[PDB]
Structure 1
Amino acid sequence: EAKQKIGFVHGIDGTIATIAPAASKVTVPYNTVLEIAVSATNIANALVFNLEKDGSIGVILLDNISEVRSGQDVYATGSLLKIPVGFHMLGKIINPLGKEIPTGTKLGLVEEMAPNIVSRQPVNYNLLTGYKVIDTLIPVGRGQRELILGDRQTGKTSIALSTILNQTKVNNEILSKNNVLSVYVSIGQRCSNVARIHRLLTEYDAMKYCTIVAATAADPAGLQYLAPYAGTTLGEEFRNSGRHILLVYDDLSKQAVSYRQISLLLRRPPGREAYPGDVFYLHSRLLERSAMMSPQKGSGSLTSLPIVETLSNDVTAYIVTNVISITDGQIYLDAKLFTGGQRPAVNIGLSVSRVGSSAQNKAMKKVGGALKMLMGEYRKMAGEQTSGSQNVSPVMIRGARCLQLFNQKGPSYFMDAIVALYAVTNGYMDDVKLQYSKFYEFLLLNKDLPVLYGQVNNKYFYMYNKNLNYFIRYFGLNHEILEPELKKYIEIHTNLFLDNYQSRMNELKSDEDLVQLKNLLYACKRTV
């Protein structure tokens, strides 16, 4: 095996390198990989960013930058960047060059042209984040790239992280074709956040269906520029295998910052906010690879959940203003609500999902049609009413009861989200207080009062099997077989709670018992 050289390094500026070529006859293509011989033993990979008239190669460095010196030789591979690919990558995190990282065959390209319109399909299947908010008012379907906005520490990462843990109970059950996999992509986040994510997904046995790509802050800029690309390539092969796949980016704004650092160090022409021109193309090269493919192309799907960090609830920034114009909707989080116990801290007014109903199932459309026609009036009433005035009307009651159900640490099963929201929108949850709504929900879902207190005028419908959602998803609750059983189970559980528990609660007008209860409520908020 003989390698081919082109020249040596002229100079470097941190992550950047310029090349002096030898044997001027020889050429190099545009976006190829270059291998630098820091020593006879160690070798550093790099990419060619631009070329010049004099004969020189602007290069971005990806590994072992500190070892680089002037006068070193260069070699060319003759191909684009590519990474190892396949099903042998789900359980392990990697570097965007494929180098597996420790923790306590096939290749694939980073830059593939996204599928054209004929190679695609309108979205019709859902992607369950596990949260009731998302699956009701702003649903995410497969092939429906949807943004996640928000300032620091509002619940951006936790959303996608629950979106992925939610897809572990199911992917075990359903076939290995409709099992939505997942790929996290961390860009510039601290390395210990990566290991904490690793231990989290390894705790829930989710890493069997979920890999991570990590280009941490210590990693160079050009390696942050390529991470969502390589994660998209990993999802692209699964799209070509017919599978479904999820894809997360945490986050793109640091990907843009890295691209800025590289263009400005390469003497490229800057523009607004010091970014170059093609940053909107930098993202459109990536996100449009997310799609729902056609049955002619395996029916695969690649869902993208790009995270972007706002600053003081601004959205007129260049990156956010561009990514919003690209995505098929967005999710807008507010720290004013993340502090007010509304966790996730969504902002339903500014949050949008252009795929409104066609992604959702048969069981969800009838529910979301009510929830839109409930919150639409809740906001007008809560906005016009005072802060202290009492209003006895079913909208201001039921909606505020719904906002409590929206608060939840971690995901929640489908069956539990529908029975909990069907109880409210039909008015069964009008007598209970605003505070014990989640305890009511906890009793409804995991416990079973009518099975305990002898009320068993219910042939099949109970909240202990958990295989019943697969009938709900098919028939839907509006079908004549589940409607009456559902209503009887809810009315009975409501009367039992209002009689036995909700009376005992108000009686505990003590010192220690109030705290003993409030810990129970704020714990039920978490386990659910």
Structure 2
Amino acid sequence: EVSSILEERILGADTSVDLEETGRVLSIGDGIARVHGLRNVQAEEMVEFSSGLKGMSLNLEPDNVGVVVFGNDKLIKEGDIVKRTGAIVDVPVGEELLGRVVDALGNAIDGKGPIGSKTRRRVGLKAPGIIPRISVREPMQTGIKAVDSLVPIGRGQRELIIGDRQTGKTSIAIDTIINQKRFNDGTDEKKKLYCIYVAIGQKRSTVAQLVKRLTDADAMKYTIVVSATASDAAPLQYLAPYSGCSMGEYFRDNGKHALIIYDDLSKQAVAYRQMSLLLRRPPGREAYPGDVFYLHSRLLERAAKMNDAFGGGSLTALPVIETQAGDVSAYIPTNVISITDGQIFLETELFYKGIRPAINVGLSVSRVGSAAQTRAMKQVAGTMKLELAQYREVAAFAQFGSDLDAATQQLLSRGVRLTELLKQGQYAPMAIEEQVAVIYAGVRGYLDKLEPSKITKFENAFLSHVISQHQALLGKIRADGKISEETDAKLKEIVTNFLAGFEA
């Protein structure tokens, strides 16, 4: 029935005539067309040429209009016809996009079929003000033992993942998508999360490897991926951050929850600098224009925690920023630091010393603080944060230390063994009830006699025990939320029973 569906489309097609407000082309070069005419175009309005490419008019000058091109300029000759559409740029949005691969303009690139979305939304909208917001209180669970213990993330906070090349910045933001599967197949409607992933200027083979990683873990039925790759034109890597917040604001407007990841924002300031200097705008520091702060501020301020009178929705934003030689005092690493709330600083030195994920907790902060942790995690990690911070003071005495006080030998002894609890393999996100049990085994003092090399083998043995043989205790910390006095004694003989006969 292949002939029937092709005959179906062409009778269902609309072949109607209209008017236009055209204007000829003056000088096409390097992706900037100059059009004479078009006397009633608004700023940032989408036009379309005679070949089929589309264009967004950025400069409204007296005798001409500067329009960037969504493609390649070898199809644009001098003396063409630039018709008018009559509308600012708009993307399809809805529930139907869940589990698809889209480019920066909402077309389908995965070849399954066209989007059946019935709604449409602008990309240039504003943030909510001061009144429709409320303070962040619910936890956003990542699944990394070092993030949820020391640098937590609430549901509406902006948290920056900053670090050099090749240190696991993409991998931290790829198991946070995997970890929300345990809520997304259940019943509790106010604990589900939806993830969006924006790739800005990466090669096509890398995105084709990451969709297969999220297809394997059955985590591409609630995730959308917006791909503006390296080969695509310079303005399509500019729209693609603003084409993802418009899909993450449909879930905030309708009482649901969301998550978005910009990978990465340091390749949007470069794809926008090229568009500026070809339109002859006045440069500034490192040849960036005067409004690169206004480019990133009005994208991150769209992440908000709404209140109950508007729906109770949320939007959480995680931008990735690549530094060069660990210098965060550059132009773009200081714009996005002063906008967001806290940073996660992944070093390269700790990655080869064995600490993986290589989160430096000396420089990582979060300014929502402890108000986004559950009551169980808050009780044990408040002492762990104080215990680790006393270790980092005395880390420089470990290389030659045996003639020190027994308190200082103790402070070294707990700091090494708390570090081994923080290491974690890739694509293994845990639960908060299993996370609080492992921290409780360490911060109390139940490990200062076990050898420091065995802390990993002890932990994988202990976790597989309490899943099968103590399942009714990890339902009274998940549902309770806090850890009571009854569960404090019940957990106390558990880690004493396992530690007694362990080495076998």
Other structure's SS at 1:269 match: coil
Other structure's SS at 1:387 match: coil
Alpha carbons of structure 1 residues 482 and 28: separation in structure 2 relative to 1, 3 Å: same
Are 2:377 and 2:432, in contact at CA under 8 Å, matched by a contact in 1?
Answer: no
Letter in 1 for 2:83: Y
Work out the number of aligned pairs and report it. 477
Other structure's SS at 1:358 match: helix
> C-alpha separation between the residues in 2 aligned to 1:65 and 1:162?
40
Residues 1:157 and 2:175 are matched in the alignment: no
Where does structure 1 lack aligned partners over 5 or more consecutive residues?
452-461, 502-528
Partner of 1:426: 444
Partner of 1:476: 482
What does 1:13-92 align with in structure 2 at a 5 Å threshold? 13-21=29-37, 26-38=39-51, 43-54=52-63, 56-63=64-71, 65-92=73-100
Partner of 1:6: 22
Q: Percent identity?
A: 44
> C-alpha separation between the residues in 2 aligned to 1:65 and 1:484?
72
What does 1:330-341 align with in structure 2 at a 5 Å threshold? 330-341=343-354
> C-alpha separation between the residues in 2 aligned to 1:468 and 1:196?
39
Question: How big is the shift at 1:469?
Answer: 4.5
Other structure's SS at 2:434 match: helix
Residues 1:389 and 2:397 are matched in the alignment: no
Residues 1:485 and 2:490 are matched in the alignment: yes
Question: How big is the shift at 1:162?
Answer: 1.1
Letter in 1 for 2:438: A
Q: Deviations over 1:110-163 (max 9, x none)?
A: 111011111111100111110011111111111100100010011111111111
Q: CA RMSD in A?
A: 1.8
Partner of 2:108: 100
Are 2:253 and 2:311, in contact at CA under 8 Å, matched by a contact in 1?
Answer: yes
Are 2:388 and 2:418, in contact at CA under 8 Å, matched by a contact in 1?
Answer: no
Other structure's SS at 1:77 match: strand
Q: Deviations over 1:454-489 (max 9, x none)?
A: xxxxxxxx1588645422xx3412x12211111111
Alpha carbons of structure 1 residues 444 and 268: separation in structure 2 relative to 1, 3 Å: same
Q: Deviations over 1:82-122 (max 9, x none)?
A: 11100111100101100111269001111110111111111
More helix by share: 1
> C-alpha separation between the residues in 2 aligned to 1:306 and 1:430?
39
Which among 233, 248, 253 is matched to residue 261 of structure 2?
248
Question: How big is the shift at 1:3?
Answer: 4.7
Letter in 2 for 1:387: Q
What does 1:448-527 align with in structure 2 at a 5 Å threshold? 448=466, 451=469, 462-463=470-471, 467-471=475-479, 474-477=480-483, 479-497=484-502, 500-501=503-504
Are 2:374 and 2:481, in contact at CA under 8 Å, matched by a contact in 1?
Answer: no
> C-alpha separation between the residues in 1 aligned to 2:481 and 2:190?
23
TM-score by length of 2: 0.91
Partner of 1:139: 152
Question: How big is the shift at 1:416?
Answer: 1.8
> C-alpha separation between the residues in 1 aligned to 2:468 and 2:497?
7
Residues 1:365 and 2:378 are matched in the alignment: yes
Question: How big is the shift at 1:176?
Answer: 3.8
Letter in 2 for 1:403: T
Where does structure 2 lack aligned partners over 5 or more consecutive residues?
1-15, 113-117
Partner of 2:414: 398
Are 2:29 and 2:73, in contact at CA under 8 Å, matched by a contact in 1?
Answer: no
Alpha carbons of structure 1 residues 389 and 320: separation in structure 2 relative to 1, 3 Å: same
Alpha carbons of structure 1 residues 66 and 174: separation in structure 2 relative to 1, 3 Å: farther
Partner of 2:208: 195
Other structure's SS at 1:244 match: coil
Alpha carbons of structure 1 residues 342 and 213: separation in structure 2 relative to 1, 3 Å: same
Letter in 2 for 1:4: E
Question: How big is the shift at 1:63?
Answer: 3.1
Letter in 2 for 1:401: R
Q: Deviations over 1:20-39 (max 9, x none)?
A: 216xxx3100011111121x
Alpha carbons of structure 1 residues 131 and 267: separation in structure 2 relative to 1, 3 Å: same
Alpha carbons of structure 1 residues 15 and 429: separation in structure 2 relative to 1, 3 Å: farther
> C-alpha separation between the residues in 1 aligned to 2:341 and 2:457?
36
Are 2:153 and 2:159, in contact at CA under 8 Å, matched by a contact in 1?
Answer: yes
Question: How big is the shift at 1:440?
Answer: 1.0
> C-alpha separation between the residues in 2 aligned to 1:469 and 1:341?
32
Other structure's SS at 1:337 match: helix
Are 1:130 and 1:413, in contact at CA under 8 Å, matched by a contact in 2?
Answer: yes
Residues 1:269 and 2:275 are matched in the alignment: no
Other structure's SS at 2:245 match: helix
Partner of 1:441: 459
Question: How big is the shift at 1:394?
Answer: 3.5
Q: Deviations over 1:183-229 (max 9, x none)?
A: 00010111111111100111111111111111100011111111111
Question: How big is the shift at 1:11?
Answer: 2.0
Other structure's SS at 1:229 match: coil
Bigger Cα displacement from structure 2, 111-120 vs 391-400: 391-400
Residues 1:212 and 2:212 are matched in the alignment: no
